Amino acid sequence: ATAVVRCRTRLARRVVAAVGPDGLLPAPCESRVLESALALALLTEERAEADATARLTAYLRTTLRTAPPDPFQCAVARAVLGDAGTALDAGLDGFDHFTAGRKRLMFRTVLAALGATGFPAVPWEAYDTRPQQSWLHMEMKALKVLAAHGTGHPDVVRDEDWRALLPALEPGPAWECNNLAQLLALLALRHSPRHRPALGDVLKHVAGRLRPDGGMPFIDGMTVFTTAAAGLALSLLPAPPACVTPMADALALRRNPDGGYGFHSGVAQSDVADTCYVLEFLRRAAPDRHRTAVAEAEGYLLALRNPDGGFPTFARGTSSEIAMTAAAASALAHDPDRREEVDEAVRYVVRHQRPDGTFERSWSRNATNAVFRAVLALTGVAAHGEERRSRARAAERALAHLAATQNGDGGWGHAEAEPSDPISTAYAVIALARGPRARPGGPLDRALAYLVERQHPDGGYRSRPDQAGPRPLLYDVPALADVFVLLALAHAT
């Protein structure tokens, strides 16, 4: 067959082979400078785990020399190994997101907690946040506590502030698989005499999480998101492998009581991104076998829908997001009874397209992610008459943005002038596969050639990561590179 189909075949064999007999595709997160620095600061202050603190120090120095992250994370590591405001401004350089204000408060307080800068002179209510993702409440309370103690006003802390941190004292892996949240909570809790009896045992478990490279990962893993995305890719192949059934089973039995899905095993917080990938996959691979899970996931999404027609990530009443809205539109469009919500979601996407054809960055730090989600919703939901024209024009502007910013090597990076990476290019390919038929030398043709060229001898892909959290800080789940390139090649062939 073609080189693209040969490439797709080798990648599919590799992805199938990586799914375990439990139906899951393992998806560990790499060490990250931020969490490693916080783990270092916590263990150092507590004079615990000398072996672990030495490896963390070595990891941080090695990473800073050989693979330095964004300026904020570098400043954090330098603070702990020892222009903070300059690093904040550079790390949040034109971070254009509805959370920007919260993020500047958070990151500044992190740096101040580590002695790199002064604490923000804000009313304590600045740290108050409406209920959203479970662990976010804990992080904000931990930073409020650190600021109260750091500025010499410990009496400001109320019992309801401490109560928010109690999950950090539970044994075993971090609550909600989030090491950042537990590390921040523990840095705060070590200032409380009445919480100190529980600290010793958790510090031993923290220290036992170090990866072989001596670092601490952001999260314990991302196996639900990764397995669902890979199942979807595999289900779009001409003859899907048998393993889609155990993958569908493994996902369905992990559904949360609200009918949605978290990003990893043991994550009780559901989110629209995970849920939409699971729903799309189950719809194709197990619509009868898992009829009830499908219906519960649709019900989960509908109960999150915001009044403006968009969907938030975690909680109704937090800002709708374009990529989440497009994802939910595509995931809900399989039931003609949901057409009203689907159409309102697609209209939300069209209203929020930018004058240059783009949408926005959120959980992905490239522009191509939201383009691909938007284009799938704009072209996958059937529409006719005036509405067909409106959606086709918006999809055309998005695909034109892709063509206009395509790098000479045929790929795309995180931004118009960045070097190409396979993941960013994979998202663009999914979108462009909704455009005109590929032609020799055309944008889709060239993008597929780039992907063919970048395939490693072992059949896989190595890519700069695109996932951020907390936004805009990147974290690296290497398993996603193979999965999203496979999803692109499955869409494009």
Ligand SMILES: CC(C)=CCC/C(C)=C/CC/C(C)=C/COP(=O)(O)OP(=O)(O)O
């Ligand atoms: C699964 C997926 C890729 C979709 C997006 C949401 C999500 C569950 C991401 C997985 C990584 C993670 C646990 C970060 C939490 O972000 P945060 O709470 O630190 O983010 P914020 O501070 O920017 O709100």
Ligand SMILES: [Mg+2]
């Ligand atoms: Mg957060």
Ligand SMILES: [Mg+2]
């Ligand atoms: Mg977090």
